[PDB]
Amino acid sequence: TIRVGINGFGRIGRNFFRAVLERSDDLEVVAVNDSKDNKTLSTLLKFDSIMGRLGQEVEYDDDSITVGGKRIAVYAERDPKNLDWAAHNVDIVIESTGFFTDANAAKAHIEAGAKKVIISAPASNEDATFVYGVNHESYDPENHNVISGASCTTNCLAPMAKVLNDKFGIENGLMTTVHAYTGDQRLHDASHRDLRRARAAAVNIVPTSTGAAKAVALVLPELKGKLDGYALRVPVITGSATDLTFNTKSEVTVESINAAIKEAAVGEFGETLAYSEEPLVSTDIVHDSHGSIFDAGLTKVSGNTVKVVSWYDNEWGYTCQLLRLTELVASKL
Amino acid sequence: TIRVGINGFGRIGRNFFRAVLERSDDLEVVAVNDSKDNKTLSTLLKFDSIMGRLGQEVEYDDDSITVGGKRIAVYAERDPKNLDWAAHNVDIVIESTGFFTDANAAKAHIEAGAKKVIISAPASNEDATFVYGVNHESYDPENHNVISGASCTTNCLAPMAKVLNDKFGIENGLMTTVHAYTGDQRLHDASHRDLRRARAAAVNIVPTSTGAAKAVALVLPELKGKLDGYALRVPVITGSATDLTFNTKSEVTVESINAAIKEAAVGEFGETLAYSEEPLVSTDIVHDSHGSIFDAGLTKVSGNTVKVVSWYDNEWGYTCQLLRLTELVASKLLE
Amino acid sequence: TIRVGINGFGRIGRNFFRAVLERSDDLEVVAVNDSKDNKTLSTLLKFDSIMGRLGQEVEYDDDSITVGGKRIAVYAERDPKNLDWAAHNVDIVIESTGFFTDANAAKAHIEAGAKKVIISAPASNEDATFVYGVNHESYDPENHNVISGASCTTNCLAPMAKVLNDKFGIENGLMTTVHAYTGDQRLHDASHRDLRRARAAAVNIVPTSTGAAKAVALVLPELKGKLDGYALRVPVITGSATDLTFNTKSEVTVESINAAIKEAAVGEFGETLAYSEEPLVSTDIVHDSHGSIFDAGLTKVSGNTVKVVSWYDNEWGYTCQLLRLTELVASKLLEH
Amino acid sequence: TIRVGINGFGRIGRNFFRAVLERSDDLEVVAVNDSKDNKTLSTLLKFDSIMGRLGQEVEYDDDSITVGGKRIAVYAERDPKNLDWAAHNVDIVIESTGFFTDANAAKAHIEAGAKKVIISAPASNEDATFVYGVNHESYDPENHNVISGASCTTNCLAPMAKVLNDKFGIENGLMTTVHAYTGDQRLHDASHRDLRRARAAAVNIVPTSTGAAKAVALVLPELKGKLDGYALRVPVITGSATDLTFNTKSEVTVESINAAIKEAAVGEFGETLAYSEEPLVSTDIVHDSHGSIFDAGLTKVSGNTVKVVSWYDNEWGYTCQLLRLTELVASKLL
Ligand SMILES: NC(=O)c1ccc[n+]([C@@H]2O[C@H](COP(=O)([O-])OP(=O)(O)OC[C@H]3O[C@@H](n4cnc5c(N)ncnc54)[C@H](OP(=O)(O)O)[C@@H]3O)[C@@H](O)[C@H]2O)c1
Ligand SMILES: NC(=O)c1ccc[n+]([C@@H]2O[C@H](COP(=O)([O-])OP(=O)(O)OC[C@H]3O[C@@H](n4cnc5c(N)ncnc54)[C@H](OP(=O)(O)O)[C@@H]3O)[C@@H](O)[C@H]2O)c1
Ligand SMILES: NC(=O)c1ccc[n+]([C@@H]2O[C@H](COP(=O)([O-])OP(=O)(O)OC[C@H]3O[C@@H](n4cnc5c(N)ncnc54)[C@H](OP(=O)(O)O)[C@@H]3O)[C@@H](O)[C@H]2O)c1
Ligand SMILES: NC(=O)c1ccc[n+]([C@@H]2O[C@H](COP(=O)([O-])OP(=O)(O)OC[C@H]3O[C@@H](n4cnc5c(N)ncnc54)[C@H](OP(=O)(O)O)[C@@H]3O)[C@@H](O)[C@H]2O)c1
């Protein structure tokens, strides 16, 4: 029973609350902070447009919600300086507001009396970034305190990149992620700092930038400077694909590329990276707990140019990787 | 030329801008206020996910945008007290932020120099509310200075209700509007004061309240207390339909209900209310300039109970109604 | 264990299959007939854009599919005369192709050795039409052999109409169903006998006819001649609502209308009709097993005119109703 | 006025009809053949979920439609051998059913009195295949009678690939086209020879195959065997992007890739290929008349690996390409 807190009970925060419920034997969410009133908060817990109804009952009052007869403290402090985790013996705070991805801002959780902070996103000034199944062994139970669990796309790309580079070496690579729309995008054409994301999300293919390809280097140093890419946001509510095209010096074939993924995708790592030969479409990978679902039927090769494609549920898959990482932290003060 | 300012360059503000280019010979938009920087504003004006590309070159600088060679002063004041419409000799302000539907607040525009204010929405404390085609002949240029052009749904409902009440007598009625999603709804399940409008707009049927059927009484006072209804937000980006079930003492048939609309839907009034026997779906009424398109194929009659359905592009149709009102105001004394 | 065949392994057929696995102790689907090859048939069982992945393993060979170890025999006969259900000991056939809603055509399943046929749609020339929870107690094991489970919309409307008519009396009413798009509609503007259903389904509000308001008269003959209505197909893949506006002679309030549903919506009937005060949107009723989910928050009253709204998952809720009817047929005399 | 018949009055057929009215001074559609009855056909001409309402009045009866006072003969022959284009003095037939992309089937239109046939798709056994702006100068009026206008995707990729191959040299490249759903796909999970295209089109990203990149070789033989790729079908109703990642021996920068397109995208060729630095999304390119709209803002370079992205309205863009080709045919012998 390692006692967990959630800062920012949004898509990832609520996906995380459910993942813990359905997957963890040893964690407990005992406090959450969120800018929403508790009626809204509990409604959005009980009903979900993507995951469906929560298995259990939810009640609320002015400073709590109660899920399956278990009382949870709730705060509404839009600056985490004004919080007090310590008061609920809270060991870890998932930082999923998306506004405290700077560790200098996030560490504030520690100041409020937390031991760990896992930011549910690419970060800055953090102690360490991890994609579970890729670089989790270099967690430092003593020094690694404010950390990143990286991005959905990085948790898709890195597993697959690592294997294929470990095997054939990647010289250069460029990625397109065709990605479900997310909450930062606008429903109607409206204000946004990014002039494409300003555009009505559910009727547009929307190009946008992503650090996810560069960010791979945070977990695979050997690929620094070797990878870049961008995203096409498309009208599905969840479910995404990472399409990577790359150059190798090795002689390769489709078969050899596919057999390497297949070979590697077993055991504990297989809980992160899956190998498929199924006729998949995006709805088939909704609620899939892998970080990366390699699609063997999409593999292409001309000369020493290779295209490979991997799926991920950007909500649920990512969240399952964030739970793995959290179990690790939780197993070692 | 009558000079117009727009406060709130959003969906309705930008439809209104284009409507003026496309349909007015005597209005010109000379200043706009909005919270966006001018690079953002000009981009959203040039490119539109519903109306397509503006047919004119657009440039911007620190103080302005220029559209087909005409400079438009641009401000970014959250508080309208800080505007200066008089500097631009603006006659009429379209209030389309959604934040100043109280006339006690919208009157700031008048104090900042405007002569008239038309709120793009149900208002309070307003001098008068109008649905063009229904009650605009009661516009009073000396006493009606801050006015409402009502809601999209009311502009769809009121014309059809006037005809049917005038010819048959509506005793009682309940409406459902099946309505395109709008910008306040959430893309992903997230915080909202309305617990249903919180839910991912583009994958849900979302019920929501609307005063639109009660508000008909503002323009047809003979129907106070007689109409109510509600909305179902559905996944289309624009285009809507109003479904009205009502009772009459008159003896009626599908045919006589339909003839009653066809008879009335001519001349000037027919620019507000259309009569159709076409096999319409919502994309067919996208960029229709009527406030109300009556679908004769959907009329049903059971005893003394009648169901009628009228379409409306809640963006462009409503805007064209607002533009009709605007032209009326501009045609008369602005003193 | 009563053994079941499905003719038409489409949206309803495959929902019905999953409903049996998940909800039934005493039925088993052992044979299916469809137009698809076994690879295609198994792919579409295994993977589902709405229901997600089957939680059983699916394999195939060239005369069968295997699901959690159970061999299901597979046919691809366009003409049901050419089937043989008796070779599989099938007592009941679900007729879910959409092409054999005439009971004179569907009776070919009985010629081919079945005992009972349940058409998953409005039918013609049928022995009897049922909405489970409304008129199923009139099922006659000897003489009701080829029957209808009526439509999705009828299974939403009838339970609500029965309670309100029993309590207050319904003089007249007109219905609008706001309904998920269905396989009859076109993805792109293209040929259809219905010129509105011809139009790209996922970008349009599409008006179309519905027989649900006549059909309620079949299971509730007190409402003969009293109801009419239509449908608006909208861009959701499943999930629908029935909006009924009616006149009553009773003096009624929002509260008394709601209380009547809440009072009725209990026990076994409560598995057909639920009563809700939740802030529902369509996704919230996806995979709900009720035929009808009354939304108390949408009730309106103007004098003696009432507007009520009930939800339904037109795929899964209807299928659960159809399963309830199947369980009843299966619980009685299948013989003659 | 050169007189045009349309076989297959579908999405492409009706796009073409409207493209002639809006864009041609010298072509007239005088006859159409389709499976539909005239009520249905006239309705789908008048009303379009993508294009909006036709500007002109539309009437029909048992053997015709009338558009803007112009009478169009209508037929419903499943088999093109039973047609008589000669009886309407038709010179060119647009073959847009999707069923006669084999030239040996499409030549039935010539037996039936047409002089030229333009297949609105990749063909087999055709006299020649053209991407207007890339290879149309090789059109041979005497020998090229049953021709192909290639695919939407090839019309997007080939102009871009020609420019970039000319300037820098393409060793190999692999394409992903993120494409609008099309009529071949299913609305609900349902029968289909392609187990991905079986899946409900408007709620899925759907991978499927395409010969569009190999087919570039037909108009640019120098790229034979150098390109392949596939499609992801996504839930927009029209509007697509071609994403090409390729290898060059050249040392290249983002700026020099972009500059190469900009320099090329001028004059007549620039009606086929546009250069843009705008913050484009798919709805911006709906009803765009170009075959290819190069998005300069998405170009990336890593070492010797280059990624470029061009937009296309797979309906109207393609159709405008197909009309350009048609205009060329109309302007030479027969
Ligand atoms: N969705 C994805 O696919 C995905 C995948 C991987 C990672 N992520 C990352 O995870 C993070 C969360 O994203 P999301 O999609 O869950 O977004 P979201 O639904 O908008 O979640 C953020 C939640 O925190 C609340 N919040 C905002 N500011 C707060 C504050 N100062 N104090 C407390 N609560 C506050 C939010 O806003 P209100 O409650 O004020 O509206 C909301 O409930 C982001 O960094 C995102 O990039 C997202
Ligand atoms: N859309 C419809 O179907 C419809 C139909 C009929 C009537 N209406 C009514 O028309 C009004 C506008 O609706 P809409 O859909 O056009 O909404 P919208 O697109 O959100 O328009 C609002 C615009 O006003 C700006 N704004 C907000 N607060 C402001 C302030 N204090 N000062 C200046 N500009 C400000 C917004 O910028 P930021 O977003 O950057 O703040 C945005 O550009 C509402 O009253 C609505 O009910 C809408
Ligand atoms: N979807 C709903 O919400 C809903 C709700 C209630 C009731 N219903 C009713 O249920 C029935 C089926 O609807 P649905 O949505 O499931 O349609 P669907 O998905 O089209 O299913 C029909 C199935 O029957 C197959 N089929 C067609 N003709 C056949 C034949 N002669 N022999 C064997 N198989 C044949 C089809 O294969 P092919 O596609 O390859 O022809 C398909 O797999 C209809 O009567 C419909 O009204 C549907
Ligand atoms: N849509 C695109 O984005 C696109 C882009 C470039 C090229 N293309 C190509 O253009 C062609 C047509 O595609 P589309 O999207 O327009 O498909 P579509 O909308 O289905 O058009 C086909 C039309 O042909 C009719 N038809 C079918 N068989 C016929 C026959 N034997 N004789 C006469 N008419 C017949 C169909 O009527 P029924 O439906 O009643 O059978 C329909 O009206 C295909 O080769 C496609 O590959 C399409």
The CATH number that applies at residue B266 is 3.30.360.10
Minimal CA–CA distance to A174: which of D307, C137, C294, C201?
D307
Q: Do B178 and B108 sit in the same domain of this protein?
A: no
DSSP reduced 3-state for B20: helix
C279/A52 touch (CB, cutoff 8 Å), yes or no = no
Q: How many angstroms separate the CA atoms of C73 and C7, rounded?
A: 12
Pairing label, strands C27-33, C2-7: parallel
Q: Do A171 and A281 sit in the same domain of this protein?
A: yes
- CB B195: neighbour CB atoms within 10 A? 17
**Closest protein CA for atom 18 of ligand 2:** B10
**Rg of chain C in Å (alpha carbons):** 20
> Least CA distance to D202: which residue of chain C?
C202
Q: Determine whether the shortest distance from the Cβ of B36 to ligand 2 is under 6 A.
A: yes
Minimal CA–CA distance to B146: which of B105, B116, B113, B108?
B116
Residue B262 resides in a domain: yes
Residue B64 resides in a domain: yes
Measured CA distances, A47 to A236, B190, C299 (Å): 19, 11, 22
Task: Report yes or no: D20 and D46 within 8 Å, Cβ to Cβ.
Answer: no
Answer with the one of D126, D160, D192 that is the final residue of a domain: D126
Q: Do B79 and B217 sit in the same domain of this protein?
A: no
Is D314 flagged in the annotation as binding? Answer: yes
What residues does D27 pair with on adjacent strands? Answer: D2
Query: Which ligand is the nearest neighbour of the Cα of D99?
Result: 4
Answer with the one of D110, D126, D142 that is the final residue of a domain: D126
Residue C323 resides in a domain: no
Residue C131 resides in a domain: no
Q: Do D116 and D40 sit in the same domain of this protein?
A: yes
Residue B66 resides in a domain: yes
Cβ-Cβ contacts under 8 Å, C234 against chain B: 178, 205, 234-236
Task: Report yes or no: C95 and C123 within 8 Å, Cβ to Cβ.
Answer: no
User: Side chain identity at D5, as an amino acid letter?
Assistant: G
DSSP reduced 3-state for C235: coil
Catalytic residue among A29, A94, A152, A164: A152
Q: How many angstroms separate the CA atoms of A297 and A279, rounded?
A: 8
Answer with the one of C64, C91, C126 that is the final residue of a domain: C126
Task: Give me ligand 1 centre to Cα A313, in Å.
Answer: 17
Residue B330 resides in a domain: no
Which conformational region is residue C314 in: left (phi greater than 0), alpha (psi within -120 to 50 degrees), or beta? alpha
Q: How many residues does chain C have?
A: 336
Residue D211 resides in a domain: yes
Q: How many angstroms separate the CA atoms of D248 and D250, rounded?
A: 5
Q: Which of B43, B185, B191 is facing A187, going by the closest CB pair? A: B185
Tokens of C299: 């009730």
Task: Give me ligand 3 centre to Cα C78, in Å.
Answer: 13
Helix axes C316-330, C152-167, angle to 10 degrees: 80
Residue B322 resides in a domain: no
Q: Do C287 and C158 sit in the same domain of this protein?
A: yes
Element housing B244 (H / E): strand B240-247
Q: Do B165 and B116 sit in the same domain of this protein?
A: no
Could you please report the per-residue DSSP string of D125-166?
S-SEE--TTTSGGG--TTT--EEE---HHHHHHHHHHHHHHH
Minimal CA–CA distance to C44: which of C69, C70, C12?
C12
Q: Which domain does C94 fall in, by range? A: 2-126
Task: Report yes or no: D179 and D122 within 8 Å, Cβ to Cβ.
Answer: no
Q: Do B106 and B199 sit in the same domain of this protein?
A: no
Task: Give me ligand 4 centre to Cα D289, in Å.
Answer: 20
- Where would I find the beta strands (DSSP E) of chain C? 2-7, 27-33, 58-61, 64-67, 70-75, 92-95, 116-119, 128-129, 146-148, 172-180, 206-208, 227-234, 240-247, 273-276, 292-295, 300-302, 305-312
Q: Do B47 and B163 sit in the same domain of this protein?
A: no
Is D193 flagged in the annotation as binding? Answer: no
Q: How many angstroms separate the CA atoms of B226 and C100, rounded?
A: 47
Cα angle B78-A8-C282, degrees, rounded to a multiple of 5: 85
User: Is the CA virtual torsion B45, B50, B52, B54 positive or negative?
Assistant: negative
Cβ neighbors of C219 (< 8 A, separation 6 or more) are: C129, C130, C131, C134, C135, C150, C154, C158
Which ligand 3 atom sits nearest the alpha carbon of residue C99?
28
Cβ neighbors of B247 (< 8 A, separation 6 or more) are: B170, B171, B172, B173, B304, B305, B306, C247, C305
Q: Do B194 and B284 sit in the same domain of this protein?
A: yes
Q: Count up the domains in chain A and report the number.
A: 2
Q: Determine whether the shortest distance from the Cβ of D96 to ligand 4 is under 6 A.
A: yes
HSE value, Cβ hemisphere, 13 Å, CA-based, for D97: 23
DSSP reduced 3-state for D207: strand
Q: Do D117 and D164 sit in the same domain of this protein?
A: no
Resolution attained, angstroms: 2.0
**Backbone φ and ψ of B13, nearest 5°:** -55, -45
Q: How many angstroms separate the CA atoms of B114 and B85, rounded?
A: 6
Cβ neighbors of B256 (< 8 A, separation 6 or more) are: none
Task: Report yes or no: D241 and D183 within 8 Å, Cβ to Cβ.
Answer: no
Which CATH number goes with the domain that contains D76? 3.40.50.720
Tokens of D116: 């030229």
Q: Do D216 and D281 sit in the same domain of this protein?
A: yes
Cβ neighbors of A46 (< 8 A, separation 6 or more) are: A53, A54, A57, A58
Q: Do B166 and B270 sit in the same domain of this protein?
A: yes
Element housing B230 (H / E): strand B227-234
Structural determination approach: X-ray
Query: Gaps (C–N > 2.5 Å) in chain B: which residues precede them?
Result: none
